[PDB]
mmCIF file with all atom_site columns, N, CA and C and ligand atoms in Angstrom:
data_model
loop_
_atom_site.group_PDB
_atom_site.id
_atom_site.type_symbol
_atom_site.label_atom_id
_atom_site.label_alt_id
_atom_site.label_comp_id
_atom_site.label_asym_id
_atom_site.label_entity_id
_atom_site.label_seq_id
_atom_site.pdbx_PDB_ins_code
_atom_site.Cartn_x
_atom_site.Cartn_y
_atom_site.Cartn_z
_atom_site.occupancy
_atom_site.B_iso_or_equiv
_atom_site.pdbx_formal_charge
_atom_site.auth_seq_id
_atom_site.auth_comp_id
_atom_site.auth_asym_id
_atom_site.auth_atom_id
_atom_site.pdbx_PDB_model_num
ATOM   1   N  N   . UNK F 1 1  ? -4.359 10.985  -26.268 1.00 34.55 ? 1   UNK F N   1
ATOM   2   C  CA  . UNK F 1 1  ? -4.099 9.764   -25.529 1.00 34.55 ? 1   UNK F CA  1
ATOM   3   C  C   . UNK F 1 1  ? -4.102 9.983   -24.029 1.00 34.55 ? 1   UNK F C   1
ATOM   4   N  N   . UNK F 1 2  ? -3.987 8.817   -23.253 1.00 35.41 ? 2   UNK F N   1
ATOM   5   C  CA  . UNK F 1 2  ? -4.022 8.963   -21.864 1.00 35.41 ? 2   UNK F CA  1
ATOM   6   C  C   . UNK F 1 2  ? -2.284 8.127   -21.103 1.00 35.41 ? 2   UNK F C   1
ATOM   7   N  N   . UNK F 1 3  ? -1.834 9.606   -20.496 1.00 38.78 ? 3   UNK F N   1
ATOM   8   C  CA  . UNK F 1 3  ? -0.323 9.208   -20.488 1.00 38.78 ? 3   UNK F CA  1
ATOM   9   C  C   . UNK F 1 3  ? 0.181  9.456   -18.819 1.00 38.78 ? 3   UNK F C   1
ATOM   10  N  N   . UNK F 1 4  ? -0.748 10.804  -18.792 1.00 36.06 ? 4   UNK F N   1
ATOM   11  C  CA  . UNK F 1 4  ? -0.726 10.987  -17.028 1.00 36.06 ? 4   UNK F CA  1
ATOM   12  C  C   . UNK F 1 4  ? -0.535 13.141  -17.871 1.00 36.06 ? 4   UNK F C   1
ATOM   13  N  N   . UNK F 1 5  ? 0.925  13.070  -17.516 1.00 35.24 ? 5   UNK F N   1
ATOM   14  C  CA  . UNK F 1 5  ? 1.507  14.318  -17.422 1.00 35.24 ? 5   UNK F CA  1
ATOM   15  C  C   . UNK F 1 5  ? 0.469  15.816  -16.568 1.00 35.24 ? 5   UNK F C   1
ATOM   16  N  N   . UNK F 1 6  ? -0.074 15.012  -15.835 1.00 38.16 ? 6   UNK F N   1
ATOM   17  C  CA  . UNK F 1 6  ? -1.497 16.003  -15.800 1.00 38.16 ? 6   UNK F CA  1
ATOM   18  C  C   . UNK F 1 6  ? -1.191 16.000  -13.914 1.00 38.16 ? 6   UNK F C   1
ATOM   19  N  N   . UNK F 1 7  ? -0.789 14.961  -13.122 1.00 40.35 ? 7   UNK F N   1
ATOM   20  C  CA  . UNK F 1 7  ? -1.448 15.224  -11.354 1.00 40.35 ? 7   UNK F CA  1
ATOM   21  C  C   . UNK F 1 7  ? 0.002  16.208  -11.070 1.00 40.35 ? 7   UNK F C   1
ATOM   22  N  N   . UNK F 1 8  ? 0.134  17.091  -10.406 1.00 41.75 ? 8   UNK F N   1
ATOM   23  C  CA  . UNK F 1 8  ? 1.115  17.518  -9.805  1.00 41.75 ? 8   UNK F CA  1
ATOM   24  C  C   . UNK F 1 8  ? 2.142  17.045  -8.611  1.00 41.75 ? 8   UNK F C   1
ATOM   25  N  N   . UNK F 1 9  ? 1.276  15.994  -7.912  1.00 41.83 ? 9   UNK F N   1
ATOM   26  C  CA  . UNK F 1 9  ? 1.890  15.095  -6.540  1.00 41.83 ? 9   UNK F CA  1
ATOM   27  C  C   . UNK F 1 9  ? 2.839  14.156  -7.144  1.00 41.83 ? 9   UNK F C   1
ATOM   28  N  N   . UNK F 1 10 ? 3.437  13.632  -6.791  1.00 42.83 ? 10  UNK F N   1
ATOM   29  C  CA  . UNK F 1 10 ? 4.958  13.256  -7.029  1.00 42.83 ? 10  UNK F CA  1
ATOM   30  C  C   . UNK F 1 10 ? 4.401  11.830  -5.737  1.00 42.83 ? 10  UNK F C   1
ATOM   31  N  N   . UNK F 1 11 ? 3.297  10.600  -6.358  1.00 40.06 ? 11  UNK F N   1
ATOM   32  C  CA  . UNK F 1 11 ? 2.675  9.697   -5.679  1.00 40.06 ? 11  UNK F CA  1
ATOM   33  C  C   . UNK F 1 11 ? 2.391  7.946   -6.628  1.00 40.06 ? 11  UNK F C   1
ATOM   34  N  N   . UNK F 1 12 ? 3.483  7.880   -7.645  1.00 41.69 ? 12  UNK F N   1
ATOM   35  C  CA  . UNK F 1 12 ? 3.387  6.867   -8.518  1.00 41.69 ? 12  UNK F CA  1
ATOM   36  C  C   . UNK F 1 12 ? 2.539  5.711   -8.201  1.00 41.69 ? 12  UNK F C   1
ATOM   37  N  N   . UNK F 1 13 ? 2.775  5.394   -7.124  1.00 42.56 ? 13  UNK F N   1
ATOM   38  C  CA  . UNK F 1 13 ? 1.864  4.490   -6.202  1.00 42.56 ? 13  UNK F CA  1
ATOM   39  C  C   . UNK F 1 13 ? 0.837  4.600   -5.957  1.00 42.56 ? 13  UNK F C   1
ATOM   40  N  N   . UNK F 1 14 ? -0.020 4.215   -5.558  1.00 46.19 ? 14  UNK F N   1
ATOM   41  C  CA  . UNK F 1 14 ? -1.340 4.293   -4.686  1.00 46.19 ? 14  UNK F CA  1
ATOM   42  C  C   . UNK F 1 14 ? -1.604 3.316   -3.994  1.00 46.19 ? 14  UNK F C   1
ATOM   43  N  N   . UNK F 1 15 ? -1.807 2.968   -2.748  1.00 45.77 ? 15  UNK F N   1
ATOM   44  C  CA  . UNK F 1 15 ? -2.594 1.672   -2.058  1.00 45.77 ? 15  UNK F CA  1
ATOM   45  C  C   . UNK F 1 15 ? -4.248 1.203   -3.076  1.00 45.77 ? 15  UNK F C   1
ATOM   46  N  N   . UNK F 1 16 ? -4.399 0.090   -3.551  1.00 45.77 ? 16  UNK F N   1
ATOM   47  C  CA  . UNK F 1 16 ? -5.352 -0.267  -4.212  1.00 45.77 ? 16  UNK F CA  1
ATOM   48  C  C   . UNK F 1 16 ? -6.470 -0.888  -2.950  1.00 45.77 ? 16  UNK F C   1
ATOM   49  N  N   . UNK F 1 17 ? -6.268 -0.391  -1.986  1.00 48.99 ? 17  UNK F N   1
ATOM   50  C  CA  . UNK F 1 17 ? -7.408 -0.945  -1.018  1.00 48.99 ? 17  UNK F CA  1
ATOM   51  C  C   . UNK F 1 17 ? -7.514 -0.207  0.146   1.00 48.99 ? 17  UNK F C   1
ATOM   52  N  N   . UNK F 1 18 ? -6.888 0.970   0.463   1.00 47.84 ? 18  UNK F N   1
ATOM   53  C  CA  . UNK F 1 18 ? -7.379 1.934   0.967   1.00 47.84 ? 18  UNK F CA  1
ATOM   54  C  C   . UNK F 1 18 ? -7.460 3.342   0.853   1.00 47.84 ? 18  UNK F C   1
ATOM   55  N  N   . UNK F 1 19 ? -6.667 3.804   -0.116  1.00 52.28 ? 19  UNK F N   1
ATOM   56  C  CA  . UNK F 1 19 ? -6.573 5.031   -0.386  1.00 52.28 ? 19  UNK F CA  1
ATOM   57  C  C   . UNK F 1 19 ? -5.441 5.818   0.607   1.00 52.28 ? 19  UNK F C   1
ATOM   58  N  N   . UNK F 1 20 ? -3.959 5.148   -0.152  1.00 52.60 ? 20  UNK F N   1
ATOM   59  C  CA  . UNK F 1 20 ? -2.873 6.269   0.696   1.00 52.60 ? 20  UNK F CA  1
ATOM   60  C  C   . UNK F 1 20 ? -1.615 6.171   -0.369  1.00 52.60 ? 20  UNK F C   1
ATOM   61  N  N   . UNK F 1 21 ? -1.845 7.666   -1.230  1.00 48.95 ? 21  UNK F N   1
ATOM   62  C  CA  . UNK F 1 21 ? -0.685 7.625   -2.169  1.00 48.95 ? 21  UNK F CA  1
ATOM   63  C  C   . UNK F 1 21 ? 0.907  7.853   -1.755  1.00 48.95 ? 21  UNK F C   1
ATOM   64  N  N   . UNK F 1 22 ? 1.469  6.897   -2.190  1.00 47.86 ? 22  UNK F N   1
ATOM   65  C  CA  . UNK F 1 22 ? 3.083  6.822   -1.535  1.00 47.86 ? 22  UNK F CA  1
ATOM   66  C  C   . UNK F 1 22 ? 4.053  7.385   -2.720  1.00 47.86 ? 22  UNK F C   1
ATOM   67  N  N   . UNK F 1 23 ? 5.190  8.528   -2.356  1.00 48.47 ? 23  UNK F N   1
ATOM   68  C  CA  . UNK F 1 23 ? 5.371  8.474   -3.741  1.00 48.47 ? 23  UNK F CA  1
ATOM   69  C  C   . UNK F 1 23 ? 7.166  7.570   -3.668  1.00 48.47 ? 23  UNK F C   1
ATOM   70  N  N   . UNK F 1 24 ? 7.476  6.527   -2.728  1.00 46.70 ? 24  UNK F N   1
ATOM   71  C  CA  . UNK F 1 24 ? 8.503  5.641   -2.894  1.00 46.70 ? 24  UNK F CA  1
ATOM   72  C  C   . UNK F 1 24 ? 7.575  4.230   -2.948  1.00 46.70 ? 24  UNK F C   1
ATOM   73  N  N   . UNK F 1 25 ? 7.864  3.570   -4.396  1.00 48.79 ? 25  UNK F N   1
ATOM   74  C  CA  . UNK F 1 25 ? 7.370  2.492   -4.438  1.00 48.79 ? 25  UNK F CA  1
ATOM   75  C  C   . UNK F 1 25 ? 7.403  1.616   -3.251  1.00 48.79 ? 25  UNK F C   1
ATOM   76  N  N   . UNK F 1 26 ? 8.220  1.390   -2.373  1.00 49.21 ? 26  UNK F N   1
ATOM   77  C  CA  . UNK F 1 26 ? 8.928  0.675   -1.175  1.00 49.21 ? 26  UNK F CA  1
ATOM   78  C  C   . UNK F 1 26 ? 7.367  1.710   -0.079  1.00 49.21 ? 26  UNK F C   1
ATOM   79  N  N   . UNK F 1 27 ? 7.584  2.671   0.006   1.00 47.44 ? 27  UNK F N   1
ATOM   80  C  CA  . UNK F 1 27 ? 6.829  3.314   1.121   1.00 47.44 ? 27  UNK F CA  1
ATOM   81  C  C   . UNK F 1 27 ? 5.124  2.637   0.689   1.00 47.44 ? 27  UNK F C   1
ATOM   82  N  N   . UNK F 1 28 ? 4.454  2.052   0.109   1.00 47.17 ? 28  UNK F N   1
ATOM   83  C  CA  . UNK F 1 28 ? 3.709  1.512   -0.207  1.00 47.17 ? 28  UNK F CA  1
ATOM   84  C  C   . UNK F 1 28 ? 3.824  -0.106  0.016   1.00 47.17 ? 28  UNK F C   1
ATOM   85  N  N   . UNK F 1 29 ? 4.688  -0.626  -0.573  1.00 45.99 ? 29  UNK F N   1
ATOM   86  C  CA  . UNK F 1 29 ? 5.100  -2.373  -0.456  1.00 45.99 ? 29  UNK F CA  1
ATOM   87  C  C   . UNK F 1 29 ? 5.005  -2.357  1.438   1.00 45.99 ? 29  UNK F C   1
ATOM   88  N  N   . UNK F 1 30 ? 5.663  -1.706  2.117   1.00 45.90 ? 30  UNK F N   1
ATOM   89  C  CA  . UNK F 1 30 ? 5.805  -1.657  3.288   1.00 45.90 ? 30  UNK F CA  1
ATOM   90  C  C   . UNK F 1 30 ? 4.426  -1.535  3.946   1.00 45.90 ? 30  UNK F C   1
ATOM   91  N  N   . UNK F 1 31 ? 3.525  -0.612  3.859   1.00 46.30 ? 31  UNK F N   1
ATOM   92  C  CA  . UNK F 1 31 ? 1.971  -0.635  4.211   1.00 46.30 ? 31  UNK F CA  1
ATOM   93  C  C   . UNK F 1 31 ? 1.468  -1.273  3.901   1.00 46.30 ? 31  UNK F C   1
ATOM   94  N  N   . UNK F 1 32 ? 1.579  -1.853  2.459   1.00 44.05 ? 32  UNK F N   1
ATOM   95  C  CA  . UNK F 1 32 ? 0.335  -3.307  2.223   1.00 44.05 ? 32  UNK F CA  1
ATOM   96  C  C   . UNK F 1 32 ? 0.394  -4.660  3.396   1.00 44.05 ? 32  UNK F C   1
ATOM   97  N  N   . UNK F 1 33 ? 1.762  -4.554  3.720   1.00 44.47 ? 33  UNK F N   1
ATOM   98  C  CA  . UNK F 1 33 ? 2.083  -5.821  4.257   1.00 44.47 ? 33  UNK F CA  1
ATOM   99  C  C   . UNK F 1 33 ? 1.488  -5.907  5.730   1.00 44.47 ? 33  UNK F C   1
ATOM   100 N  N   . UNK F 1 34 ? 0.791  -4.420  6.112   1.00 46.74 ? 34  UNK F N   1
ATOM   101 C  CA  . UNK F 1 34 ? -0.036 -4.220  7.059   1.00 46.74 ? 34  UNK F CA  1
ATOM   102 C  C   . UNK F 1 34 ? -1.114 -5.134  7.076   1.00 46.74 ? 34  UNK F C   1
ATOM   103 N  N   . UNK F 1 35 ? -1.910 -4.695  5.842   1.00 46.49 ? 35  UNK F N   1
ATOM   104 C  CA  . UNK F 1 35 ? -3.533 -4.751  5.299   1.00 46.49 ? 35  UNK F CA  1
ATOM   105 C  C   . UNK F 1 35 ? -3.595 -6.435  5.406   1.00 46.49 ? 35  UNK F C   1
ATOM   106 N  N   . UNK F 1 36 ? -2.582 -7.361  4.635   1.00 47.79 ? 36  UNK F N   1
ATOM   107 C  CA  . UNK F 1 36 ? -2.364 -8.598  4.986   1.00 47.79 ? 36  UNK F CA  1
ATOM   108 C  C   . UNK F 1 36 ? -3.333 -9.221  5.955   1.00 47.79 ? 36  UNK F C   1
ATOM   109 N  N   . UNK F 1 37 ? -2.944 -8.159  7.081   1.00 48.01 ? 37  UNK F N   1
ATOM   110 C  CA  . UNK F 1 37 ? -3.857 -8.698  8.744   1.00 48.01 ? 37  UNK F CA  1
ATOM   111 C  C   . UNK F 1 37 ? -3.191 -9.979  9.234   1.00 48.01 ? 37  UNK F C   1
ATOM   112 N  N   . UNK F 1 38 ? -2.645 -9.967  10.892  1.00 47.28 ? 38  UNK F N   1
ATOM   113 C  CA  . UNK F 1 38 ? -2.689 -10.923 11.205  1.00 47.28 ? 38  UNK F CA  1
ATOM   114 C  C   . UNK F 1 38 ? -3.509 -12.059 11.208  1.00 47.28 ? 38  UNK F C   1
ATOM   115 N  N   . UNK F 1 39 ? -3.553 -13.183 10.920  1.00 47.12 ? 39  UNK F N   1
ATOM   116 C  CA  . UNK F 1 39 ? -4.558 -14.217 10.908  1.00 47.12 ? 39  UNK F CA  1
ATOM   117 C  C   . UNK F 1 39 ? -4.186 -15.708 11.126  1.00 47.12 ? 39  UNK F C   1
ATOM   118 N  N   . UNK F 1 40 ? -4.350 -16.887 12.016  1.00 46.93 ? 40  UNK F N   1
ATOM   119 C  CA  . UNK F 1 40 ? -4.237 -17.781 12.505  1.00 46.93 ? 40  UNK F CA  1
ATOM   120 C  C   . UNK F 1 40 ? -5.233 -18.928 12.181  1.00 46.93 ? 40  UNK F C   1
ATOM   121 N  N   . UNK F 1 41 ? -5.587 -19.870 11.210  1.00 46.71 ? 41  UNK F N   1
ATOM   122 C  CA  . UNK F 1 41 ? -6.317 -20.471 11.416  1.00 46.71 ? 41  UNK F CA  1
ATOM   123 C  C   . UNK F 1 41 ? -7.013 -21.270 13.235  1.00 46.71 ? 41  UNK F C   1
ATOM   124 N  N   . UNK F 1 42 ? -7.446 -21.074 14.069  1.00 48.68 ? 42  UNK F N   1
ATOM   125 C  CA  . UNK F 1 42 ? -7.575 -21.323 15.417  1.00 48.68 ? 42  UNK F CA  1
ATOM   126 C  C   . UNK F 1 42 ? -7.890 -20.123 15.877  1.00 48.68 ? 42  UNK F C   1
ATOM   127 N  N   . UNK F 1 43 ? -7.317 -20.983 17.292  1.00 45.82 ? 43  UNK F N   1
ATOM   128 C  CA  . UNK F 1 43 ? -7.879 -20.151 18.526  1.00 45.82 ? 43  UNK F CA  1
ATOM   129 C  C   . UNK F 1 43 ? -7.048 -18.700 18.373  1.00 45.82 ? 43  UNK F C   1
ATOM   130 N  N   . UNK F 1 44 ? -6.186 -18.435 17.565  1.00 41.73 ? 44  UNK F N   1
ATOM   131 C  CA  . UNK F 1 44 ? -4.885 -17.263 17.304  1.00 41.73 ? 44  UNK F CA  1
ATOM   132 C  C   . UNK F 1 44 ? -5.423 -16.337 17.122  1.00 41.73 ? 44  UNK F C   1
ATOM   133 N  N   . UNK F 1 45 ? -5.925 -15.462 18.201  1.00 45.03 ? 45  UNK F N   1
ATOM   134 C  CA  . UNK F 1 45 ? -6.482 -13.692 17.731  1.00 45.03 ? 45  UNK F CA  1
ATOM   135 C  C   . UNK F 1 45 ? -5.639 -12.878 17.492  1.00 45.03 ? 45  UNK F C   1
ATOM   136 N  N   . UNK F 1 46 ? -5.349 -12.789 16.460  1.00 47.10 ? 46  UNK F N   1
ATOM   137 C  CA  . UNK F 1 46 ? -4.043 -11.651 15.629  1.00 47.10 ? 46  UNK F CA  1
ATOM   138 C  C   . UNK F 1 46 ? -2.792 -12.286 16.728  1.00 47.10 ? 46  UNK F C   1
HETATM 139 ZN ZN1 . ZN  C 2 .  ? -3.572 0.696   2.268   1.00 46.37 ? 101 ZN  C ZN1 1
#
């Protein structure tokens, strides 16, 4: 079967859109909210 017991890094997480394994679920939630991107419908540049 396929269960894991196999990577040695201690990284439960992974960013699914850039590639940066976190191993505190929170240390991940916190970077996505980066990727988000500022955005303004208008004249609002970030
Ligand atoms: Zn990311």
């Amino acid at each position: 079967g396929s269960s894991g017991s196999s990577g040695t890094g201690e990284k439960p997480y992974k960013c699914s859109d850039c590639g940066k394994a976190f191993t505190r679920k929170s240390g991940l939630h916190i970077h996505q909210q980066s990727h988000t991107g500022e955005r303004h419908s208008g004249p609002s540049s970030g």
